[PDB]
Each structure stands twice: as structure tokens, then as C-alpha cells.
RNA sequence: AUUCUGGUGUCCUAGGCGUAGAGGAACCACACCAAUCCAUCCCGAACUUGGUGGUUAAACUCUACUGCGGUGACGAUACUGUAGGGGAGGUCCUGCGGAAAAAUAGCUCGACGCCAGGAU
RNA sequence: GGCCCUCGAGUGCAAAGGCAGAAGGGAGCUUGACUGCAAGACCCACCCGUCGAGCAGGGACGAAAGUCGGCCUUAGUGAU
């Protein structure tokens, strides 16, 4: 559960996830890496979930790096209650990922392996991704 | 009871009366603290009765 | 006038240009100031002491120092001053090469244990400090009558730039090293 | 606060409020380092046709 | 020393020249050689100058380039003697960034008793 | 009429630093002393006063290079005014019109006005 | 005490906007925290609020030009 250290304020807007992310696009650690095409709010345990089962198919060696992190909230409010009377207390922390950007990046394994094991970690995520192939 | 508005008469005009131009003393009402600034405040200013520049005593 | 400062600029000038070979007379490395730093921090509740101790130094020379004021202590008093802390005297002039060479002669043979002044000790930028653990070095002082014994520093004040020069400058002007 | 600060034939005042002194058209010129100023000047002649 | 004295120059002048109609008088002063200059109102040309670098009362002083209170104050006579020449009684007297004390004191006391009234 | 040095602006980082060199005939600055004018929360460091016997070293002024700082396109792209369209999955696509920021090419080591004094 | 970025400090009290030889820090002298007003604007349903060039008198501080009718600004308050 990747959760951000004491940030600035409590609670924050919704907003919106409009254009495609154009900087986390371009990989730095890895050879082979798994990119978003539909925009989400992913938590962190479907972060964690993902990290775990991407590791779980590494095996023999090769390395695996997280390129996205959360930082914002999202509120739930007190379960079965009217509307009004406040916002709620944060319930998890989650991260808006656009189109067209890297959530895991790998090297290190056979080519064979490395698509095997983000199956797994695409079939973990609630958003259609893909392989790519770079550095 | 802690700082507190007070009465800044005359000396420059204490209280006369008759010859229709009457006298009528002036008056400035403005605050200090009376824990700070133990002592009565003696201020030098105009006074359109004088006519002057008068030094407005301090009173209650 | 002292022995110092009459065979400073007589024979003192032209000797440090031709280890280091300077174009004018006057950027020969040489003493703007000295500051006498006394910086005590019980002398906030009882200063009788520090009252003595501005005499102490001000009966050597004849210059005195300057009651010293702490930056920030705990007080709101916004229109009036905060804490006192200690003394400290800026020397200039003739009374500057006075203090600095009886210095060397009547007060440091009274300095027990005291082989010399550390040679690699300067800031970096040709200045330096020596400190004492005692203020009654100096020739006037008498261990009896004095109030607390309170220790001290000396920071020497020079417009030279390299390390070489200011040992050398002590060395012309006549200071017992260390190695 | 002084955004703006004020120039030429232009008072200023203890809100720093920026009021005209004279007739004319307002100008808002460049300060040097990273500032704005308020002058004001009159115009010579406005013809009609 | 010269480097703190060209703010006592700023500071004085924002504020003086801030107000207009500014026939200013600008007294200068140097370890050799004192100058003074009378400038515009809207600040483009000077309207009169005087000092002991020019050619008519330097070969009447006594003093090797003239930083004294003796010259000062001739300085001061000839100052005021151009500017009524010129036409000009009030101007705005300028202390340029020297403290007003000696030889600028003795400038106006010479340039207030000519005529010259600031 | 032209060029310097000393004073005053318009113009404010195409105008600022660093590096390298150069200037004392003048002007400008550092070194001499301080009864007195006057001064140091101590100190002629500074302010001030009286003198000159040194110096272009520091500052200041002037000539260079792009090392930094600064400014900075075209093209595209994001975004968006307006007229439409696709998706239930939450935003996307089109015509018509405006158009960044960033990045890079590249551009810069001031310009220009008046006055005082010196030189052609 | 020296060096180095230089305004990230401070600005009685929350925040925002401001403030360099300063609106920040120190000293000298004082009381414009003054009477009589006021062209003209801002803000608005009304009630209310806000800025004010300038003139008149009588002062303050300065050599002078000038600056001063409270506070660096926006809260510290109630009609009849």
C-alpha cells in the first residue's frame, strides 16, 4: 500500500482526467515495460496487487520498477447516511493515470518471461494496457 | 479596565463664559494604556478657541 | 611609540615582496584590526564581573570594548533590547600595534604549559584568532582580586589572502609557534 | 498591496489606491526590474470629421 | 567608501527630484578638485556650472586643486553670481551625497548671503 | 564638426557576471596627520577638518571572447471560440477560426540623449 | 572574524497582496492620533462603507525642496 507521506492538505476535488499523459511515456530503467490506453483512478492496492504478482513470474533475476505513485485522495463518506453535512474522511489514495503512460517498467529477464509475467499484472489492473519494447 | 479612551481637555482655555464671543473650552478624546503609560498624558495641540497651540492637559 | 610599529614600516615594507612579488607597497599583506572578543553567557543575570573585565582590558591600552547584545533570546519586548551577553574591544591605529606586540612580551610569559600558537589555523582567506582560557595573562591582572575567572579570545584582522602569508606576517612581527 | 506603483501625474494614497491628478489617458508602463507604474497623460488634439 | 556614497546620492535624489520645477543645485566634492552644476526641470541640460577644474578663479586660489573650506566658499559666490546672471532666483538645493556639514555648508552659506536665496 | 574623462538621464537584464588584457597628460581613487569644526552605543574603520611625499595594485573606466546568466523564433503539438458527431463511460472525434508553455536553431558581451572639462 | 548564494528574513496578531539602501532594523527631535472644509471618483436595492488632489488657519521635523489630518494594506464591530 504505496501511500504518500503527510501531504499539504486533508481532502481534494475529483477534477477530471481530459488528454493524453504525455511525460511518463518514455522509459528509463527497463527494457520492457506495461503502458495505459484508457484513463483510471488506480489504487494503491491495485498497485500493490500488480507489483506482486509482476515479481512472482520475474523468478531467476531481472528487475522490476513502479514508475507511478498516488499522492491523491478520495473521500467515502460515513456508510448509509443522507446527503450534506460535510465532505468524508479519506478512504484510500489513488492515481490518475492518462493515456499512453508506463504504470511498470522491467530488464533483465528473457523476452519470453517478461511478457508472461505483465499477463498477470495487466489481468490485476481494472484498465486495458499494453506491452512496449524500447530500451 | 485595560487601555482606555480618555479626556483631553485644555489648560489653554479653562472654563470662562461671558462676551458673546464665548470661550467654551476644546476637547480631544483618544486612548492610552493605563497599565503602559502610568502618568497622566500631558499632549501639546491646536485649539480653535485659543486660536494657538495650546497644551491639552489631561483629566479623568 | 612602540617596537613594534617603528620597525614596521621601516624595515618591515619591502621584505614580504620578494617571497611573493607584489606590484604596489600597499597590498603587502598587513593589520587592519584586532578584535578582543569576550562572549560570556552567565554575565545575562549578574554583570559586576563583566563590569570589572571592561576595566581589565581598557587599563592595558586605553581603548575599551563595547557592551555586547545577544541576536535573539526570549522576549515579545518589540521597542526596547533584548538579552546582554559579553564585551569585546576593536583596536585601530597606534594603540592596534601597541596592544599587539606587549601582548607578546609582558603578557605571555605568564601563560604556563605554553609551547606556542597553532601554525595551521587559519581560516583560509589570511585571518586568524588565538585563544586564552584565562584573562589574566596580562601583566595589570592579580588572581586575588578579580571577580570570576572567565577566558577570552583574539581575532587578528589583516587584509592578506594566502596561508603562507599571514604565518609570516606573525613571524615578522614576532609571535612564539607552534613546530 | 503596490502591484501596480505610481508614476507621473499621479497621486497615490494610503490604501495605495492609484487616482489621476489630471485629465488625460491613462498608461500603465514598464518598470525596470519585474514591476509595473501608472502615469497619466493629456492628449494635444482630437479632431472630428 | 565611494561605493556606499552613491546610495546617499540615490536615496536624496528619488525624493528630491520626485516633485516638479526642479531648478536643482548639484554640489560635487572630491580629495582634489570640488564642482557644483545647475540642471533642468524636465533633467535634459545643465543651465549654469561652476568649479576650481575651470580656467577663471583656479589661477586666482591659493590651494593645489581645491578641497578646502577658503574655496568652498568662493565657490559658493561664483555659484550664485552665474545663476541670477542666468535669470534664476529659487532653486533646490542638492547635497549630491555628502553628509551637510563643512565645505558643503560653507557652499550654501555663501550662496544663501549672495542673493541666491534656495 | 569628432573623440575621451567627470556629472545628469532615457532605457532596465540583446544592457548582468566570469575570464583575458589595458588607463594616470588631465579627471578619479588608495596612502600622511588630526590642537581645532565635528564624530565613534569602543575605534579619525566610517563622518568631518588640515595637508600631499607615493600609486594605477584594489575600486572605477575602457577593449575583447560566449564560459555562464539573459532573451528567443519558424514549424509542429497541447488548449480553446463556434457548428456538428461517437461512446454509456466518462471522455473522445470532426469542420470552421485563434494558438501556446517547454525545447532547439539563433541572438546578445549595451544602445541613445544633454551638460562640464580636455584633445584633433 | 572572514567567505558564499544574495532577499529564501522581518513586517505586534490569520492569510493574501506588498516592501531595498526599503513599508524591514537603529538613533535625534517631537505630537498632523489638529480645527475649518473639499473638486472629484469607487462600492452599491436601501441603510452603510471607501480613496481624495487642493484651499484656509495654526504648528511639527529639515539647511532646503518638501513630508505629516494615526499605523505597509485588507478584520478589531452595530442603526433607531
Redesign the pocket.
Same mark, same amino acid.
Given at each position: 500500500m504505496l501511500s504518500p507521506k503527510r501531504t499539504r492538505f486533508r481532502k481534494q476535488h475529483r477534477g477530471?482526467?481530459?488528454?493524453?499523459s504525455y511525460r511518463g511515456n518514455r522509459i528509463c530503467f527497463g527494457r520492457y515495460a506495461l503502458q495505459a490506453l484508457?484513463?483510471a483512478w488506480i489504487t494503491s492496492r491495485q498497485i500493490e496487487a500488480g507489483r506482486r504478482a509482476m515479481t512472482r513470474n520475474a523468478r531467476r533475476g531481472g528487475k522490476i520498477w513502479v514508475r507511478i505513485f498516488p499522492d491523491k485522495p478520495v473521500t467515502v463518506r460515513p456508510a448509509e447516511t443522507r446527503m450534506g453535512s460535510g465532505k468524508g474522511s479519506p478512504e484510500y489514495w489513488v492515481a490518475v493515470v492518462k493515456?499512453g503512460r508506463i504504470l511498470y517498467e522491467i530488464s533483465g529477464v528473457a523476452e519470453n518471461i517478461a511478457r508472461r509475467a505483465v499477463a498477470i499484472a495487466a489481468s490485476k489492473m481494472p484498465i486495458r494496457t499494453q506491452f512496449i519494447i524500447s530500451g | 479596565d485595560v487601555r482606555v479612551k480618555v479626556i483631553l481637555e485644555c489648560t489653554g482655555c479653562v472654563r470662562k463664559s461671558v462676551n458673546k464671543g464665548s470661550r467654551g473650552v476644546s476637547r480631544?478624546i483618544?486612548?492610552?494604556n493605563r497599565h503602559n503609560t502610568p502618568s497622566r498624558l500631558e499632549?501639546?495641540?491646536?485649539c480653535?478657541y485659543c486660536?494657538?497651540?495650546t497644551i491639552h492637559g489631561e483629566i479623568k | 611609540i612602540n617596537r613594534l610599529k617603528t620597525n614596521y614600516?621601516e624595515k618591515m615594507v619591502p621584505l614580504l615582496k620578494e617571497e611573493f612579488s607584489? #606590484?604596489?607597497?600597499?597590498?603587502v599583506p598587513k593589520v587592519?584590526?584586532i578584535?578582543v572578543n569576550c562572549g560570556i553567557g552567565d554575565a545575562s543575570q549578574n554583570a559586576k564581573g563583566l563590569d570589572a573585565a571592561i576595566n581589565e582590558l581598557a587599563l592595558i591600552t586605553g581603548?575599551?570594548?563595547?557592551?555586547?547584545?545577544a541576536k535573539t533570546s526570549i522576549a515579545?519586548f518589540?521597542?526596547?533590547?533584548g538579552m546582554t551577553l559579553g564585551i569585546?574591544?576593536?583596536?585601530?591605529?597606534?594603540?592596534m600595534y601597541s596592544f599587539l606586540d606587549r601582548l607578546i612580551n609582558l603578557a605571555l610569559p605568564r601563560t604556563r604549559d605554553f609551547q606556542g600558537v597553532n601554525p595551521n589555523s587559519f581560516?583560509?582567506?589570511?585571518?586568524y #584568532?588565538v585563544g586564552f582560557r584565562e584573562q589574566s595573562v596580562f601583566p595589570e591582572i592579580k588572581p586575588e582580586i578579580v571577580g570570576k575567572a572567565r577566558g577570552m579570545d583574539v581575532?587578528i584582522?589583516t587584509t592578506a589572502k594566502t596561508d603562507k602569508e599571514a604565518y609570516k606576517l606573525l613571524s615578522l612581527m614576532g609571535m612564539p609557534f607552534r613546530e | 498591496?503596490?502591484?501596480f506603483?505610481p508614476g507621473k501625474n499621479v497621486?497615490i494614497?494610503?490604501?495605495?489606491?492609484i487616482?489621476a491628478?489630471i485629465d488625460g489617458l491613462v498608461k500603465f508602463?514598464?518598470?525596470?526590474?519585474?514591476?509595473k507604474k501608472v502615469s497619466v497623460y493629456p492628449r494635444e488634439i482630437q479632431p472630428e470629421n | 567608501?565611494?561605493?556606499?556614497?552613491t546610495?546617499?546620492?540615490?536615496?536624496?535624489?528619488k525624493?528630491?527630484?520626485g +516633485?516638479p520645477?526642479?531648478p536643482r543645485l548639484?554640489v560635487?566634492? &572630491?580629495?582634489?578638485?570640488?564642482?557644483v552644476?545647475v540642471?533642468?526641470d524636465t533633467?535634459?541640460? +545643465?543651465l549654469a556650472?561652476a &568649479?576650481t577644474?575651470?580656467?577663471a578663479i583656479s589661477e586666482n586660489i591659493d590651494?593645489?586643486?581645491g578641497? +578646502?573650506?577658503?574655496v568652498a566658499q568662493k565657490i559658493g559666490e561664483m555659484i550664485a553670481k552665474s545663476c541670477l546672471e542666468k535669470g534664476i532666483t529659487?532653486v533646490?538645493?542638492?547635497?549630491?551625497?555628502?553628509?551637510?556639514?563643512?565645505?558643503?555648508?560653507?557652499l550654501?552659506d555663501a550662496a544663501?548671503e549672495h542673493g541666491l536665496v534656495?
Open positions: 477530471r482526467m481530459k488528454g493524453i484508457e484513463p493515456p | 480631544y483618544t486612548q492610552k499632549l501639546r495641540k491646536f480653535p486660536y494657538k497651540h | 614600516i607584489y #606590484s604596489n607597497i600597499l597590498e587592519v584590526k578584535v581603548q575599551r570594548p563595547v557592551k555586547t547584545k515579545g518589540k521597542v526596547r533590547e569585546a574591544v576593536t583596536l585601530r591605529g597606534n594603540l581560516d583560509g582567506h589570511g585571518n #584568532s581575532c584582522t | 498591496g503596490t502591484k506603483h497621486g494614497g494610503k490604501d495605495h489606491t487616482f491628478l508602463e514598464k518598470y525596470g526590474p519585474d514591476k | 567608501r565611494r561605493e556606499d556614497r546610495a546617499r546620492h540615490v536615496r536624496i535624489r525624493k528630491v527630484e +516633485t520645477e526642479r548639484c560635487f566634492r &572630491s580629495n582634489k578638485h570640488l564642482y552644476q540642471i533642468d533633467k535634459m541640460h +545643465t556650472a &568649479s577644474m575651470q580656467k590651494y593645489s586643486a578641497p +578646502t573650506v577658503e529659487k533646490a538645493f542638492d547635497r549630491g551625497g555628502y553628509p551637510y556639514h563643512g565645505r558643503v555648508k560653507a550654501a544663501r534656495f
